[PDB]
């Protein structure tokens, strides 16, 4: 039956879709990570500027 060849086509495409989808999930996770790491660094900058401002005060 044609299912012999058709399942080999579909197997390669399903494997392909899984690899691409896993990378797309990582891309979304990295975008969220950028917000989280930016939020940490701006607060660390504020805390340093605060310590300097208190010393000048």
């Amino acid at each position: 039956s044609q299912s012999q060849g058709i399942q080999q086509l579909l197997q390669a495409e399903k494997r392909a879709a899984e690899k691409v989808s896993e990378a797309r999930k990582r891309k979304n996770r990295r975008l969220k990570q950028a917000k989280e790491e930016a939020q940490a660094e701006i607060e660390q900058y504020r805390l340093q500027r605060e310590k300097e401002f208190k010393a000048k005060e």
Partner: protein, 54 residues
């Protein structure tokens, strides 16, 4: 004929999986670019506003 066609495609179909893995590695390269772009845009915009406040 048929057995040689099956052996030939069983070899060649691996290049489709390889190019899909390269497409996944390009999506991960876009992940690394967009991480640095988003972090840069956020940090520099707010760092300047924080500096102007103090």
């Amino acid at each position: 004929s048929d057995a040689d066609v099956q052996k030939q495609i069983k070899h060649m179909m691996a290049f489709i999986e390889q190019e899909a893995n390269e497409k996944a590695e390009e999506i991960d390269a876009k992940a690394e670019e967009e991480f640095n772009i988003e972090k840069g845009r956020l940090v520099q915009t707010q760092r300047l506003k924080i500096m102007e406040y103090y």
